[PDB]
Design a protein around this ligand. Structure first.
Ligand SMILES: Nc1ncnc2c1ncn2[C@@H]1O[C@H](COP(=O)(O)OP(=O)(O)OP(O)(O)=S)[C@@H](O)[C@H]1O
Ligand SMILES: Nc1ncnc2c1ncn2[C@@H]1O[C@H](COP(=O)(O)OP(=O)(O)OP(O)(O)=S)[C@@H](O)[C@H]1O
Ligand SMILES: Nc1ncnc2c1ncn2[C@@H]1O[C@H](COP(=O)(O)OP(=O)(O)OP(O)(O)=S)[C@@H](O)[C@H]1O
Ligand SMILES: [Mg+2]
Ligand SMILES: [Mg+2]
Ligand SMILES: [Mg+2]
Ligand SMILES: [Mg+2]
Lengths: 7, 351, 352, 111, 99, 111, 55
């Protein structure tokens, strides 16, 4: 349950 | 079903000083609904989709017109924000969520959702920008515009079936966006500069030449009507995006007459708020007619819209509010025109 | 009963010195905020809208200190946030909504209690653009934060994880409104005085008619900032949309020499008291003469770092004494004269 | 170090390093000493384009302000990168001492 | 596209826009029509023209398939621009005097 | 192509295109050939010394030197730019052949 | 050679910490700078890496 990508 | 006169009448009850914009919104909304009823329209010609684009300065009724419209109409209405939106697969948000929220408002009635409205505020914030070396990637921008564009052009959208549990049975009901109405708004700050260059050729130098002063600068008020798609593209929008929004409702800056009405005519007007504030404090507040005119002149100068009014009133009553609780036996407070300018301080009845 | 603004200002006066206008604004807002909190039902057809505050002042004026003092006296939840850490949605830095989460913690996750809360966003001038122009690149740590804060200030529903995002996939995120939350955005706008001068100090040419002040008659930042208007802020880098949400603009004056002398001794946690306590636990008594305090104020004013300058002047004067004082024995009192600040003399010592 | 939201290391990472020394004992780290070397490498370029952002030099100074003065800073346990939807260890830098250093080049000319 | 920064991504985006309309069909997309506007403005942006002509001459472009959070390099669809017809438009006001 | 640190473009993109032609088979790319066009544009023609910076010209030649000579090159997976991300595969250009072609204008006058 | 000597006395039982002295090679083109490094890597047991400062 990893988090979404962040720029 | 609703008539434009009815729409404008309901809007006028809550909005002040946007006669032309209200007309455009009413006409566009009515025509859009008439288009949905007569899908075939007994003709080979297909009517262009009328999606409104609201352009106006701060504190002019953009975010208010949308809310008032929702109150009147019965169809679903969702108020999104472009700032939250981001490119797909990022932490911020997704564009598909808009339809999801729309269905929740419509009780998951796909038939009703396809007939709903959608208001996107702060659309100017997703304007295209030049690449930054330090930033990893520019997600809140062009990418979001393309997602909204594919949503506006008309495409099926998959919505989970109420999110019953981890596994929702993968129903992924399809929602069509071809019949949905979009109202994209935002104060395109800096657009007046782009428009000015395009339509202003400067001034001459001779005797016969017409010299133009700063008062003739032709600022955003009366300068946003001349806007063309080329100016928006320079601001950062996509050309195809503009073509999807033919209707361009422009909101002019609020005049002193409109501001004075806002001070007293609304049910939750600024003057009524302070009166209630004083009333629960055992005091009665009275605003003179001259004072309201002075407040509007100061607020207009600030170029902050109707929100400026609170700044002027707060400053005038700052000292009074600070020492009114300590003062005893005071039943009424009167604000004269001088109080707004600061030369005098507000008469207090000690009866 | 309800605390009146006079009572609130007195508690602020104990720790703050000289900021009368700013103290009034905060006192009035807190009183109005409590009035709204009590009259939550509002049995009338009127919605009492909030007025956000914007604190502007030089360094060492008392902005952050005012917020800290306020927290001590605030029954409702109060949190202090830094705008530097915030970033626009979708970026590595942070999410603006985190402030509300920080606020809920203060209220033990009582949404109804948090909604009626106060927030102080410090360093608000550091999320500003460089010019009036919209932008040239994505200003994540800048206008992007301002664009994100608009909805937070005006009023909206923000999502918040109650305990942990990883405990459950959705975790039934809490929805908390902000239409009633009060915001106090405080920043030390640097270069704003220059902007106002260009708009106010006209006729700055070269001829006879032109006025040249030679940095003597020139109005200081404290006097100039008093004439601040939103248009000046737009040029500094703020968004028009962001100022309208902050109608109340309270300004803090530059600290004069007399105010600095008061700061040294009168406040509860005054600088002199701190050094006296440091020596007191060491077995020594520290005495400051009145002449010394006047000298320290003049030196600190030159630094143009606010009241923080005082610490530099005092620490430098007591550096030699603090270094060799523990080695010394039988020393019970230390006296600082006016000459000690200049450096010509050595602080007098008492043995016994 | 760099300003928040950019690819470079954040300013809160300093506290993370401090936690390593204290076996992740926040109470023990809040009373620590910190030495920030090469503090002269973060300086405003006076003669530079107005419309730009000095994330490396000015942003770092802006970010360190609340840290030096004292604030409840968010500290990722590992500290590699900051993620908004991530658990953070709140640390207070009001008692931490900072000793900045750096060979200022060209200061003698300014003086 | 006159910015002249990461032109490869910007020109590639054009192809990506076509695929969305093409329903992510490489065969149908390769038959598409591309219209470029205001081609006169870039003239004086030599780098912009150089990037464009490579796209006009024909090249293979990598477009992410059906969006997605993260996808491997190989998964990217390979479309050829040699088979795509490109139309360049624009008004050349000064050109009349030149003739 | 631009000097590293500038937003225009980087010199590693070349190898990226080469990988695409080899189906991302590194061992098959190292044995490849690369044609670099418009090399004369990089030449300092109207140099006007670059005390501020030289990005489109001398800054590109300096970068290519090791690429041509042969060194491991960090290549992003696909259509990405360099960043702290560690999702980079190393490619060796020691055996790659380079054919730099340019329509040098005014060289005849120099000769 | 000195690098190897410092590695042998990992413990360094003395009140002395040996500090490294870095090298700066200056020379014209086609002189042997890069070549010297490559040759060194052939006979270097300790990890040797080559970096390009332009990137
Ligand atoms: N025409 C109007 N009639 C009545 N109240 C108005 C009008 N225009 C502005 N107001 C007042 O201003 C408030 C905000 O108006 P908005 O329509 O939100 O302005 P805005 O265009 O949304 O500003 P932003 O920040 O650019 S979204 C309303 O709640 C009213 O109190
Ligand atoms: N009016 C004041 N009364 C008492 N102490 C003060 C006053 N102004 C400054 N100080 C002292 O200066 C310290 C810092 O004051 P702050 O208000 O935090 O400065 P500032 O306004 O935050 O400037 P910043 O944070 O760089 S924007 C306080 O902790 C006090 O010790
Ligand atoms: N002293 C030398 N002995 C043997 N071969 C040499 C010598 N100097 C140069 N060479 C040859 O020249 C080639 C390049 O030498 P390098 O040392 O790489 O040049 P350089 O010192 O790197 O100059 P740069 O890197 O272009 S500034 C080598 O591969 C050898 O073939
Ligand atoms: Mg709005
Ligand atoms: Mg502060
Ligand atoms: Mg060629
Ligand atoms: Mg070499």
């Amino acid at each position: 349950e990893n988090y979404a990508l962040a720029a | 079903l609703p008539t434009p006169h009815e729409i404008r009448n309901h809007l006028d009850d809550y909005v002040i000083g946007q006669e032309q914009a209200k007309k455009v919104l009413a006409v566009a909304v009515y025509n859009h609904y008439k288009r949905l009823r007569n899908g075939d329209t007994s003709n080979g010609v297909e009517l262009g989709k009328s999606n409104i684009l609201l352009i106006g300065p701060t504190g002019s009724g953009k975010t208010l017109l949308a809310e008032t419209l929702a109150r009147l109409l019965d169809v679903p209405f969702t108020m999104a924000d472009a700032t939250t939106l981001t490119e797909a697969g990022y932490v911020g948000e997704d564009v598909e969520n808009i339809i999801q929220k729309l269905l929740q408002k419509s009780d998951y009635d796909v038939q009703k959702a396809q007939r709903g409205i959608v208001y996107i505020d702060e659309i100017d914030k997703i304007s295209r920008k030049s690449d930054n070396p330090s930033i990893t990637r520019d997600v809140s921008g062009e990418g979001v515009q393309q997602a909204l564009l594919k949503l506006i052009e008309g495409t099926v959208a998959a919505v989970p079936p109420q999110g019953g549990r981890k596994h929702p049975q993968q129903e992924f009901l399809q929602v069509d966006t071809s019949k949905i109405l979009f109202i994209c708004g935002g104060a395109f700050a800096g657009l007046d500069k782009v428009i000015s260059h395009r339509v202003e050729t400067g001034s001459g130098i001779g005797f016969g030449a017409t010299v133009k002063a700063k008062s003739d600068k032709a600022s955003e008020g009366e300068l946003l009507a001349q806007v063309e798609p080329e100016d928006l593209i320079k601001f950062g929008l996509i050309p195809e995006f503009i073509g999807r929004l033919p209707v361009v409702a422009t909101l002019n800056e609020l005049s002193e007459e409109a501001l004075i009405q806002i001070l007293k005519e609304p049910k939750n007007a600024l003057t009524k708020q302070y009166q209630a504030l004083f009333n629960l404090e055992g005091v009665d507040l009275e605003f003179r007619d001259e004072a309201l005119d002075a407040i509007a002149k100061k607020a207009m100068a600030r170029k902050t819209g109707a929100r400026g009014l609170r700044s002027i009133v707060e400053a005038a009553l700052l000292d009074t509010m600070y020492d009114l609780p300590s003062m005893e036996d005071v039943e009424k407070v009167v604000i004269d025109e001088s109080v707004i300018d600061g030369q005098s301080e507000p008469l207090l009845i000690y009866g």
